[PDB]
Design a binder for this molecule. Structure first.
Ligand SMILES: Cc1cc2nc3c(=O)[nH]c(=O)nc-3n(C[C@H](O)[C@H](O)[C@H](O)COP(=O)(O)O)c2cc1C
Ligand code: SF4
Ligand code: SF4
Ligand code: SF4
Ligand code: FES
Ligand code: FES
Lengths: 87, 212, 263, 40, 51, 428
């Protein structure tokens, strides 16, 4: 339920082949540029950083959760339909 | 004790149990004891109504309650795993549960436990081969004053000596329920040889009316 | 305008009524620990870990439930709001079976941290733990209910998001144990979401039983298929392979979770 | 009086209690309704 | 949280197990900050600008 | 003053341990149902008016003020009815008081559900009760039918507009159901799992409807405290702690009793005057309890000068709850006893709060090791420290009832434990 990994603007890159090393069973690659996390602080700065190196950025926006009303007593209504069971 | 089912044959959800129609007619009094909605609230006496038609509430009888009430079956077990008054295991005829908390312990209930244990075979919490007595070490019973204390499925025997327990059980095996009540003569909770509070005929009606 | 002055170490916040202390403190960032609470399930203070000293009070309040009135100043890092936690986590960790390396949820435990972040170093518990029987729900969901923490965060899923009412709480005391009283299989839609919910690794997914460990994953965010909802997903890789399916939070599609088929 | 006049609690069966409320439903008024039949 | 516990003590006392499971995976979780330490090794002012 | 005698004219729960028609036709003989008409018709706000002037505080564990508690719902309509509830569940080890007032004067109880029901404004009262009290509770429905036969309840409170009924509900033997709220959920037909208290019972309770969770004394006193007190009744006890009280005594005594006196009497006289003195003498009386069980100990160093006020005892570090007095003499294993109380709460608590599932059971194991003495002493102040980790960390005040028996045991009898630490230490 912890959410500190949010508040940031990681800019990982796409993935490419990860073949199986036929000797050991190991996994190996060609693209060194795959494990390339980068922590930013605002989206307006990220595009400025990637455009500054010409890379075809592809943004996804924030997904803010709503502020929800959760009233404990409404679990225990006379009229209504939220009458919980098992306390 | 284990608080979960193990679908034995004698305790499977197809055993013979069903409320006699006298008992159905007792339900609709209890569901008109509680409002139209919230008819799922009668679970305590209703499920206890089966306890009195028979001990050892089977899995099937619990599931019957859901049928009369259309409550989820799981919400039946929740109650029956919780309260100690009910009985899910095959119990005896008498269910002689006893206090062992401090004031009744302090008044030598262990001897009442020994004399009772010494003469039946049941250590603490199991049956006789006759299926009559199922001793239980329970904790309090409300009558903490009349200090030694037991219970016979609804009754109350109190102020009972180690000698008096022998007097009891010699009757129950081949007799009747021998007068639920205290010994040493104290009526309910008299001061045991001389009463001191009332000592008079109380005041009749309208004594001390504050001008209403 | 239906807003209430509320204080958090001096903040001048304004919040709608009927809001907890969390929904206030969550604005700023004073993220409070959580075991009984989810942002979508009913409220029930059973864990009693979200405690805090409201200013000018001898008693603390379960912030999961206590709404927020005018003029209230909170002290999240008080001595009394940490003593209230170092004790609690030092209670939970007295019947828990030390199975972290066994546990499916190594880095995905919301208890290991919250014993580190706020729990103490030492478990003075030295008497002897308890045990609990293991269950046989089904092939999707393993059960280790020796480490269940009586949080009620599962049984309030079936009863308010899937409509089943079978995973009751059986018993009392430490002797209490969640699970059916009987031997029934909870193989219905959304039954797999219960794994993401149990923060403890008590119950967890049999397919991803032990195939991996979460820090090892390289997580890629992608979309459901196989139903026309097009809900969202977190995919878990390991060395160019696949091990889990996990959901993202979009507030419109599904809400937070997925169905067992695409899991 | 020095005689125990609560004597009439020994000769009760296990059904005696609820058998009384079987009678009481006639002495009683009708009850509310939550609109619903139950929480369904 | 800053040192691993006694190996006989991680093996019964729960909390010492969890820290042992997170020290050797995650670790200390330092605060942000910065230093320039120093020490005269045989060479001289060996020091670290850990950030 | 030097009160404590209570000339028997002011016995309020007469036929306490007695006879002579507990049934109807003889409760009327004692003074009951007499002026219920204008007691009822005059008004609710008048009744809550007088009860506050009566200085009648709680009679369960908290001693909370009435009037206040009931005036929390004198509200106008909201859409759904107003109920009333009674803790006929005695509970504690020592409280037999409500195994007695039920029989021997049931009608007085019935008044308060009726009178107090309109003094708040209600529709119908439910009496949960301990599911062991079968023949006990059976005495009620006999009394309650005859009420309806007398036209006293049902469309007509003695011939008035305030329709009302007195339904009774049977528990299943659980001390937590004696609590204010899980009671409501037990009555609701669920596990006895309590609630949290921004939704007070007066805003939402049984059936999602508001309630007044009274106890037996606070209501059975209502008829003959409102027609015969309000200012007179206040003269008894003391200023905050005014009234009378159905005390009860058990343990290491000649004649244990259920006596009631002018409240806040000094503790010594309750063992001297009534309920004849402890066995042996007064080098005996090792570690009394004033309250039932959720109150701490008292080491006889104060038990001379005790004054049984709720609040003067808070200098004594106890809080008078049910006032089910327990007494202990010299020749005892006290740590066996006080540990049984944690063996009691272990078998008992609902198992919902984290620091009661495994705080109580945790203390159970520790004290159980102290009785044998094969522990070590450094726990003795740790075990204190955890007792403080449960005070304000639990839904219901059981934790306050499960901690204080220990803290009081430790506030005085630290060294008695230190001996057993040495006695075993000799045994390797
Ligand atoms: C664990 C626990 C058990 C309790 N059991 C009872 C009980 O059995 N009977 C009772 O009257 N009160 C019991 N109480 C106290 C009730 O809250 C109290 O009786 C009730 O609030 C009535 O308050 P009053 O005295 O103002 O009427 C219990 C409290 C706790 C914490
Ligand atoms: S739930 Fe699993 S990972 Fe978390 S503390 Fe318990 S055993 Fe360790
Ligand atoms: S199984 Fe998990 S979610 Fe369910 S009660 Fe136990 S700890 Fe909570
Ligand atoms: S303190 Fe114990 S008995 Fe009271 S609500 Fe919490 S778990 Fe239940
Ligand atoms: S303590 Fe023995 S009956 Fe209550
Ligand atoms: S996290 Fe708030 S009471 Fe559980």
């Amino acid at each position: 339920s912890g959410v500190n990994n949010t508040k940031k603007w990681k800019m990982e890159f796409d993935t490419r082949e990860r073949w199986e090393n036929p000797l050991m069973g190991w996994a190996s690659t060609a693209d060194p540029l795959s494990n390339m996390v980068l922590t930013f602080s605002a989206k307006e700065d990220a595009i400025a950083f990637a455009e500054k190196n010409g890379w075809s950025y592809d943004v996804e926006e924030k997904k803010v959760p709503k502020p929800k009303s959760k009233s404990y007593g409404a679990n225990f209504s006379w009229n209504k339909r939220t009458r919980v069971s098992t306390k | 004790a284990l608080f979960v089912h193990r679908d034995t044959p004698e305790n499977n959800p197809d055993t013979p149990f069903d409320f006699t129609p006298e008992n159905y007619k007792r339900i609709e009094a209890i569901v008109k004891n509680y409002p139209e909605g919230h008819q799922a609230a009668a679970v305590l006496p209703v499920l206890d109504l089966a306890q009195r038609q028979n001990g050892w509430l089977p899995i099937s009888a619990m599931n019957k309650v859901a049928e009369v009430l259309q409550v989820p079956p799981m919400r039946v077990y929740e109650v029956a795993t919780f309260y100690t008054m009910y009985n899910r295991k095959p119990v005896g005829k008498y269910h002689i549960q006893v206090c062992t908390t401090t004031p009744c312990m302090l008044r030598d209930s262990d001897s009442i436990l020994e004399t009772l244990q010494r003469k039946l075979g049941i250590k603490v919490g199991e049956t006789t081969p006759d299926k009559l007595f199922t001793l239980i070490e329970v904790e309090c019973l409300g009558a903490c004053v009349n200090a030694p204390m037991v219970q016979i499925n609804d009754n109350y025997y109190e102020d009972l000596t180690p000698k008096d327990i022998e007097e009891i059980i010699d009757e129950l095996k081949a007799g009747k329920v021998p007068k639920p009540g205290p010994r040493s003569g104290r009526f309910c909770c008299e001061p045991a040889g001389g009463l001191t509070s009332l000592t008079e005929p109380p005041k009749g009606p309208g004594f001390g009316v504050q001008a209403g | 305008s239906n807003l209430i002055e509320v204080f958090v170490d001096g903040q001048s916040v304004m919040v709608e009524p009927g809001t907890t202390v969390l929904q206030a403190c969550e604005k700023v960032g004073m993220q409070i620990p959580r075991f009984c609470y989810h942002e979508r399930l009913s409220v029930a203070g059973n864990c009693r870990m979200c405690l805090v000293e409201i200013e000018k009070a001898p008693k603390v309040v379960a912030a999961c439930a206590m709404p927020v009135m005018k003029g209230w100043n909170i002290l999240t890092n008080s001595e009394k709001s940490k003593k209230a936690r170092e004790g609690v986590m030092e209670f939970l960790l007295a019947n828990h079976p030390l199975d972290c390396p066994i546990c499916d949820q190594g880095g995905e435990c919301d208890l290991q941290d919250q014993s580190m972040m706020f729990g103490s170093d030492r478990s003075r518990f030295l008497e002897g733990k308890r045990a609990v029987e293991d269950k046989n729900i089904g092939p999707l969901v393993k059960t280790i209910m020796t480490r269940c923490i009586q949080c009620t965060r599962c049984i309030r899923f079936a009863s308010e998001i899937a409509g089943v009412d079978d995973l009751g709480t059986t018993g009392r005391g430490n002797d209490m144990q969640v699970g059916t009283y009987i031997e029934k299989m909870f193989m219905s839609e959304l039954s797999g979401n219960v794994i993401d919910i149990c923060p403890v690794g008590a119950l967890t997914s049999k397919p991803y039983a032990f195939t991996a460990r979460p820090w090892e994953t390289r997580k890629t965010e992608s979309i459901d298929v196989m139903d026309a909802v097009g809900s969202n997903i977190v995919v878990s890789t390991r060395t160019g392979e696949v091990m889990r399916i996990l959901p993202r939070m979009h507030e419109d599609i599904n809400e937070e979770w997925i169905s067992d088929k695409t899991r | 009086t020095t005689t125990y006049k609560n004597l009439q609690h020994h000769d009760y069966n296990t059904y005696t209690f609820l058998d009384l409320n079987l009678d009481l439903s006639k002495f009683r008024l009708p009850q509310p309704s939550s609109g619903r039949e139950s929480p369904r | 949280k800053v040192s691993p516990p006694k190996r006989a003590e991680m093996k019964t006392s729960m909390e010492s197990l969890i820290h042992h499971f997170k020290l050797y995976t995650e670790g200390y979780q330092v605060p942000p900050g910065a230093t320039y330490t120093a020490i005269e090794a045989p060479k001289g002012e060996f020091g670290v600008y850990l950030v | 003053t030097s009160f404590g005698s209570l000339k028997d004219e002011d016995r309020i729960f007469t036929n306490l341990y007695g006879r002579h028609d507990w049934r109807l036709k003889g409760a009327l003989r004692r003074g009951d149902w007499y002026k219920t008409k204008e007691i009822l018709l005059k008004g609710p706000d008048w009744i809550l008016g007088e009860m506050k002037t009566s200085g009648l505080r709680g009679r369960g564990g908290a001693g909370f003020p009435t009037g206040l508690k009931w005036s929390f719902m004198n509200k106008p309509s909201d859409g759904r009815p107003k109920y009333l509830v009674v803790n006929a569940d005695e509970g504690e080890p020592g409280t037999c008081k409500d195994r007695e007032i039920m029989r021997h004067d049931p009608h007085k109880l019935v008044e308060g559900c009726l009178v107090g029901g309109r003094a708040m404004g209600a529709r119908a009262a439910y009496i949960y009760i301990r599911g062991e009290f079968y023949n006990e509770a059976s005495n009620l429905q006999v009394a309650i039918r005859e009420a309806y036969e007398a036209g006293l309840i049902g469309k007509n409170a003695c011939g008035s507009d305030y329709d009302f009924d007195v339904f009774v509900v049977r528990g299943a033997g659980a001390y937590i159901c004696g609590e204010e709220t899980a009671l409501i959920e037990s009555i609701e037909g669920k596990q006895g799992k309590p609630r949290l208290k921004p939704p007070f019972p007066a805003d939402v309770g049984v059936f999602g409807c508001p309630t007044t969770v009274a106890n037996v004394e606070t209501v059975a006193v209502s008829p003959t405290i409102c027609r015969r007190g309000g200012t007179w009744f206040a003269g008894f006890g003391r200023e905050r702690n005014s009234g009378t009280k159905l005390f009860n005594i058990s343990g290491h005594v000649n004649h244990p009793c259920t006596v009631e006196e002018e409240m806040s009497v000094p503790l010594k006289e309750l063992i001297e005057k009534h309920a004849g003195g402890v066995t042996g003498g007064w080098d005996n009386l090792l570690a009394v309890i004033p309250g039932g069980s959720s109150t701490p100990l008292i080491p006889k160093s104060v038990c001379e000068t005790v004054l049984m006020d709720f609040d003067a005892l808070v200098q004594a570090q106890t809080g008078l709850g049910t006032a089910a007095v327990i007494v202990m003499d010299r020749s005892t294993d006290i740590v066996k006893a006080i540990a049984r109380l944690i063996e009691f709460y272990k078998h008992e608590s609902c198992g919902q709060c984290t620091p009661c599932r495994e705080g109580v059971d945790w203390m159970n194991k520790v004290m159980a090791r102290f009785v044998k003495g094969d522990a070590r002493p450094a726990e003795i102040d740790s075990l204190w420290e955890i007792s403080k980790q449960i005070e304000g960390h639990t839904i219901c005040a059981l934790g306050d009832g499960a901690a204080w028996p220990v803290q009081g045991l430790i506030r005085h009898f630290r060294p008695e434990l230190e001996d057993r630490m040495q006695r075993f230490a000799q045994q390797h």
